[PDB]
Amino acid sequence: DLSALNPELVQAVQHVVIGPSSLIVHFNEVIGRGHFGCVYHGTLLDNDGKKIHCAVKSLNRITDIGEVSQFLTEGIIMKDFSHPNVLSLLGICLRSEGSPLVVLPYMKHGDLRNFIRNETHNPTVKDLIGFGLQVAKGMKYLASKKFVHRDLAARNCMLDEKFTVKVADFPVKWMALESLQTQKFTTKSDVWSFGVLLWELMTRGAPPYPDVNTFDITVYLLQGRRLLQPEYCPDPLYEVMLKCWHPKAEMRPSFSELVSRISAIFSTFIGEHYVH
Amino acid sequence: DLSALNPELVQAVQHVVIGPSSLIVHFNEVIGRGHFGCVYHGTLLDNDGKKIHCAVKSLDIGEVSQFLTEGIIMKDFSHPNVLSLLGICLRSEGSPLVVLPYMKHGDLRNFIRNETHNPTVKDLIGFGLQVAKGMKYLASKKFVHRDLAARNCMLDEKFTVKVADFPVKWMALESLQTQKFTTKSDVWSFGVLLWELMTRGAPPYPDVNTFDITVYLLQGRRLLQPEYCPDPLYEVMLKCWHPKAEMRPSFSELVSRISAIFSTFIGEHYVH
Numbered sequence A: 001d002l003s004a005l006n007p008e009l010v011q012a013v014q015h016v017v018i019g020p021s022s023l024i025v026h027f028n029e030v031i032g033r034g035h036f037g038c039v040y041h042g043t044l045l046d047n048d049g050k051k052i053h054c055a056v057k058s059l060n061r062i063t064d065i066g067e068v069s070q071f072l073t074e075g076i077i078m079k080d081f082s083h084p085n086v087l088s089l090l091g092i093c094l095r096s097e098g099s100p101l102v103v104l105p106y107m108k109h110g111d112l113r114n115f116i117r118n119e120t121h122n123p124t125v126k127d128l129i130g131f132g133l134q135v136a137k138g139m140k141y142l143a144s145k146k147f148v149h150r151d152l153a154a155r156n157c158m159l160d161e162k163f164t165v166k167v168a169d170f171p172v173k174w175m176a177l178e179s180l181q182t183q184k185f186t187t188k189s190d191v192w193s194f195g196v197l198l199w200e201l202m203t204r205g206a207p208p209y210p211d212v213n214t215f216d217i218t219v220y221l222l223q224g225r226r227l228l229q230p231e232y233c234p235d236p237l238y239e240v241m242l243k244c245w246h247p248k249a250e251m252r253p254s255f256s257e258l259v260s261r262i263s264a265i266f267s268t269f270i271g272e273h274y275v276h
Numbered sequence B: 001d002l003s004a005l006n007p008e009l010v011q012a013v014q015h016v017v018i019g020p021s022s023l024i025v026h027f028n029e030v031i032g033r034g035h036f037g038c039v040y041h042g043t044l045l046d047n048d049g050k051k052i053h054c055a056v057k058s059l060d061i062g063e064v065s066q067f068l069t070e071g072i073i074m075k076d077f078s079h080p081n082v083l084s085l086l087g088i089c090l091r092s093e094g095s096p097l098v099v100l101p102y103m104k105h106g107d108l109r110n111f112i113r114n115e116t117h118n119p120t121v122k123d124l125i126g127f128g129l130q131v132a133k134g135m136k137y138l139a140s141k142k143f144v145h146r147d148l149a150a151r152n153c154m155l156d157e158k159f160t161v162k163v164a165d166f167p168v169k170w171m172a173l174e175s176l177q178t179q180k181f182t183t184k185s186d187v188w189s190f191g192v193l194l195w196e197l198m199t200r201g202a203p204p205y206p207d208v209n210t211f212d213i214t215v216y217l218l219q220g221r222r223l224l225q226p227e228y229c230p231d232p233l234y235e236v237m238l239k240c241w242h243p244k245a246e247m248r249p250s251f252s253e254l255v256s257r258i259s260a261i262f263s264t265f266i267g268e269h270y271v272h
């Protein structure tokens, strides 16, 4: 419905809500491919009088109060995040006859996987390490807030005009061993996924374990087998990836540790095509 | 994992939280066999200071926030056939505690399966009518249960059925393929529940595998009429299992229909 919901919860989410008379969605201007849903070009008029171009995602017609309520508390959580490497929520739009709208800053270069996959772009080794370093900074921030991402991957990281990486969309070949067997997702589980994301970057967007099946991944990892060092990957960064794939979660590096480690490797490299 | 959450969400949950100083938990006095988790006998002091016998379930910011909003949702429901939430207790050192009114006769599946109990065909239909009324209430709130089953309904002292815990062999055909749950998806699960009641707690589809259940229902095979189930009630069951979600009856129509079937019987060992 619109507000067959709890008054206290509706009050809690108000600060996230965008009035539709300050939002224009160009439903004829699509930016999505499908992965994030159906995403459109938007124009948002803020309370400050500033008119900005944005991305607007249209939800499936959510049909029960349990779902709408979970959606709203997710919105509340994302609105609270404030880091340059974590994607911002501009707000949500609850309309009378139609599904809710999620309003996000426009991300000029789309997601990180597709940016590095097309031959038109030429990221250096340093550029790719840089993207991973930005991802780690955002993930360090999220961990500091006690927040598990649960779906870290290069496809789920966005790149703006200033080439700032935005962690978004907070998948068995990205999952930690314990997540595959015991179904447990922690901050150390995100460290494993980060490792896979680094591997993705240093291969420029190659699919992980391309010759192992989704159901065969668990037995593969119990053979001590890991993803092989990518062609753009430096030896010291590969040892970072291996540490991310330790089967015991407590034995993996923290994101705070990954930031200082990768940062040190990054500072040794020179030559960039995509700065900031 | 303390309240370093969004202040407005924390203020939204305040009406649901119980001050731990009004609660004693008997951690050495255990309730149940683990289906509902770690449940214990508790004593709760209400707003007037009245002692109330309760059951106490012992449970990242994302999970804790969703837990809180589910508590906000549950605390809002007010219907005799829906399990009420007395509150939640968010301790300084330890897991959140969920506080529920004590249900004397536990879950419905265990109660009917017990040979010591002698529910009549009318009693079992009555228990189904109670489930339907709670579900009609939930449907009216636009709320989907998602896990309706005999094991997930409770029985109190006055033999009031309380729908709780809001499972492939209870799942609707479109849930087994599209992963989508609706109020009509709940109607299907209710039919399996009615079947559970009439067979006095027999496992459904006992010979078929968990993964072979979707192809089983696609063939048009269903649960056979329970030995001691009335013909018009098995028709209700079959209507609840209609392959077209929109062709199944509403819980409002289930109430009235089952109310009628119930009324054509006499003989109750468990009166409500």
Ligand SMILES: COc1cc2nccc(Oc3ccc(-c4cnc(Nc5ccc(F)cc5)n(C)c4=O)cc3F)c2cc1OC
Pocket (backbone or CB within 6 Å): A031, A032, A033, A036, A037, A039, A055, A056, A057, A071, A072, A074, A075, A076, A078, A087, A089, A092, A102, A104, A105, A106, A107, A108, A109, A110, A111, A158, A168, A169, A170
């Ligand atoms: C140039 O090309 C693109 C540009 C883009 N620009 C901006 C966003 C894009 O895609 C998206 C990224 C992110 C999310 C996203 C939505 N909601 C939540 N959470 C959320 C939950 C509940 C709630 F109430 C509010 C929020 N999260 C965690 C998200 O990551 C949605 C998206 F459509 C772009 C995509 C593009 O190409 C595909």
Ligand SMILES: COc1cc2nccc(Oc3ccc(-c4cnc(Nc5ccc(F)cc5)n(C)c4=O)cc3F)c2cc1OC
Pocket (backbone or CB within 6 Å): B031, B032, B033, B034, B036, B037, B039, B055, B056, B057, B067, B068, B069, B070, B071, B072, B074, B083, B085, B088, B098, B100, B101, B102, B103, B104, B105, B106, B107, B154, B164, B165, B166
């Ligand atoms: C004597 O025999 C028994 C007696 C009992 N008496 C009273 C409760 C029992 O079991 C329970 C029933 C229900 C729930 C239950 C908890 N939380 C939620 N949701 C919820 C989410 C978040 C939030 F913050 C609060 C709430 N729901 C939807 C529930 O159904 C928990 C239970 F332990 C009893 C069990 C017994 O035998 C095992």
